[PDB]
């Protein structure tokens, strides 16, 4: 299945939602300009594949500690 | 008290813990580089002065209907 669209800085950032974009070396970006690629998930009833590690309640592993759901994110050691 | 610390894109953003910096009309940046100036929430008295709406859990308003709290951001209306 194919990962979740790209986005960000070179990127080098995987989507997660209409407006979560995240990466190892980037950080979450949660409702900005670098979530701008994202804003096309929408157009896709999706479930789409990422591929990183099921953490908290919904929201896989999207960079360094943070449990960042689609829905908004956070903290998570969980991720390492 | 302190009013939290300007970060990111020309100051034109406020620090909501020590790894998120949001602006209404930025977004919530998280574990992002431009949380560049807000790692120095730890050497401050804490909570610091904020000036939002305090949705979500013990969270805050900090961006277009995000909840940005200092563990994370969760996109919640309360915050239009």
Do not use: M, W
Not at 4 to 19: A, D, I, T, V, Y
């Amino acid at each position: 299945v194919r990962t979740c669209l790209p986005c960000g800085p070179g990127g080098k950032g995987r989507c997660f939602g209409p407006s979560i974009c995240c990466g190892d070396e980037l950080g979450c970006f949660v409702g900005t300009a670098e979530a701008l690629r994202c804003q096309e998930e929408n157009y896709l009833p999706s479930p789409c594949q990422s591929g990183q590690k099921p953490c908290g309640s919904g929201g896989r592993c999207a960079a360094a500690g943070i449990c960042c759901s689609p829905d908004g994110c956070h903290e998570d050691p969980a991720c390492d």
